[PDB]
């Protein structure tokens, strides 16, 4: 009966939460946040994410190396992520993917690091938390190329059009919709959400990044997810309860269901 929301992409361990992380986390229940998937961006950061997830029953963890950090991976980075994943709190592999917009790391280096994490997720049968920036065609080619985990995962902060959305949904991924869906300028994204529907989306804040409209210029956090749901419900012409139920069920199935 409850209107619960799930944040599938948070970075609560980042320094922007140093002064009030405890308060933010302890208020999840009051704010209708059922659980959050806290994501790491490199080996050191993933360790901090895991340590934090172990302090709350409502925080699960994703470990990985972001494409920006691809040129920095140690030779045994996959073994190190695999060691983290021994912890039951780890429910996914990521952030991992390609970012050809910033290109902090060379494209071929990003591709190999991404491929290696996709292979690890397949091995552990863990869903992937994928980051794609101006590289949808390239990421698509890579993902369809190999043996993906049963529960493929989520293409977080999905930023392409309907055609690409359909291609990924058909591959078995769900799409992460966050703060930007509320931006007056993002007419395109809203149209995508309208075409795709609730069966293929999960909510996310990507906190502290990309706050929803009423809070531009402010640190983003899980409780602001309500504005994302509000917009989605308005664009789809359905009750907020419908958006919450569907996205939460989607998130529960992907991240919390016991996997072989």
């Amino acid at each position: 009966h409850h209107h619960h929301m799930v944040d599938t992409h948070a970075h609560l361990h980042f320094h922007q939460f140093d002064d009030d992380r405890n308060a933010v986390i302890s208020s999840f229940e009051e704010n209708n946040i059922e659980f959050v998937v806290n994501v790491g961006v490199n080996l050191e950061d993933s360790k901090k994410s895991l340590d934090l997830s172990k302090t709350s029953d409502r925080i699960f963890c994703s470990v990985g190396v972001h494409p920006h950090d691809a040129k920095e991976v140690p030779e045994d980075f996959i073994e190190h992520l695999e060691k983290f994943a021994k912890d039951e709190k780890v429910v996914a592999i990521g952030e991992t993917g390609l970012d050809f917009f910033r290109n902090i790391s060379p494209a071929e280096v990003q591709k190999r690091v991404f491929v290696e994490q996709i292979e690890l997720a397949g091995k552990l049968n863990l869903p992937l938390v994928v980051h794609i920036r101006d590289a949808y065609s390239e990421a698509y080619e890579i993902l369809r190329t190999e043996s993906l985990p049963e529960k493929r995962g989520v293409i977080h902060a999905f930023s392409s059009d309907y055609e690409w959305a359909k291609k990924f949904i058909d591959l078995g991924f769900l799409l992460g919709i966050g703060g930007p869906v509320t931006y007056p300028k993002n007419e395109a994204l809203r149209e995508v959400v309208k075409r795709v529907g609730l069966e293929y989306i999960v909510l996310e804040t990507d906190c502290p990044f990309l706050p929803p409209q009423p809070f531009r210029g402010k640190r983003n956090e899980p409780k602001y997810l309500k504005y994302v749901v509000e917009t989605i419900s308005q664009v789809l012409g359905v009750p907020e309860a419908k958006v919450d139920e569907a996205t939460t069920e989607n998130a529960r199935r992907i991240f919390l269901e016991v996997k072989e």
Side-chain angles (χ1 to χ4, degrees), residues 1-74 77-260:
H1 329 287
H2 302 131
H3 293 13
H4 285 176
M5 306 176 65
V6 172
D7 185 346
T8 60
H9 205 98
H11 305 287
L12 293 163
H13 58 298
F14 282 10
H15 82 79
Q16 287 84 1
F17 285 102
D18 285 353
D19 308 311
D20 68 347
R21 180 177 293 118
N22 297 350
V24 169
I25 291 165
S26 70
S27 60
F28 283 170
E29 193 165 54
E30 320 160 18
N31 283 304
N32 302 126
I33 296 300
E34 185 172 300
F35 72 94
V36 314
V37 175
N38 207 71
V39 194
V41 297
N42 59 51
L43 265 29
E44 295 61 48
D45 185 79
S46 287
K47 200 301 189 281
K48 291 174 98 300
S49 178
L50 178 54
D51 283 351
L52 178 59
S53 74
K54 286 162 67 62
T55 68
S56 163
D57 290 343
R58 296 185 180 234
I59 300 173
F60 294 86
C61 183
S62 184
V63 300
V65 181
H66 187 287
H68 291 354
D69 312 66
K71 66 186 163 58
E72 315 297 1
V73 302
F77 99 92
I78 287 297
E79 279 205 309
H80 203 142
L81 290 174
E82 178 162 35
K83 172 186 177 177
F84 286 158
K86 294 302 290 195
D87 199 289
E88 55 275 57
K89 278 287 198 162
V90 174
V91 300
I93 291 298
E95 215 166 323
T96 183
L98 306 176
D99 178 339
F100 292 174
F101 175 71
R102 283 297 294 302
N103 280 111
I104 294 301
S105 283
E108 292 306 312
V109 168
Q110 287 187 40
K111 285 176 172 185
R112 78 149 234 134
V113 168
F114 177 35
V115 166
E116 306 194 312
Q117 286 178 83
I118 287 172
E119 298 182 311
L120 174 65
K123 175 180 171 192
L124 307 179
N125 204 18
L126 288 176
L128 287 148
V129 164
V130 187
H131 171 93
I132 300 175
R133 191 60 25 184
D134 295 339
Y136 285 90
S137 173
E138 295 89 337
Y140 183 73
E141 277 291 319
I142 292 178
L143 289 159
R144 70 166 191 42
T145 292
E146 41 198 318
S147 186
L148 301 175
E150 292 165 351
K151 298 259 178 56
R152 312 245 182 289
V154 187
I155 301 305
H156 113 91
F158 180 75
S159 56
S160 198
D161 59 2
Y162 185 62
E163 177 176 341
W164 269 127
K166 182 150 167 307
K167 295 283 288 196
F168 278 93
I169 284 177
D170 286 340
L171 193 50
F173 283 88
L174 256 65
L175 313 179
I177 307 303
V181 80
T182 68
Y183 299 172
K185 315 306 175 183
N186 293 331
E187 315 271 5
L189 186 58
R190 280 191 287 288
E191 187 57 44
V192 172
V193 167
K194 197 164 175 178
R195 305 283 294 293
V196 175
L198 294 180
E199 192 185 323
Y200 304 114
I201 60 172
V202 284
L203 312 165
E204 77 175 73
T205 58
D206 196 18
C207 63
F209 314 122
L210 311 165
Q213 196 52 26
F215 291 99
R216 297 308 297 276
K218 298 289 168 47
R219 177 189 73 182
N220 193 10
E221 61 179 279
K223 72 181 179 185
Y224 294 158
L225 211 41
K226 63 199 283 64
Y227 299 104
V228 173
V229 164
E230 172 171 45
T231 294
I232 294 174
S233 71
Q234 301 174 331
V235 163
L236 292 172
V238 306
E240 291 183 336
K242 298 223 199 310
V243 185
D244 291 335
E245 177 178 61
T247 54
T248 287
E249 175 172 312
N250 285 346
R252 283 174 185 167
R253 184 187 70 248
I254 291 172
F255 300 106
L256 304 183
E257 218 159 82
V258 181
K259 303 173 177 61
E260 272 184 47

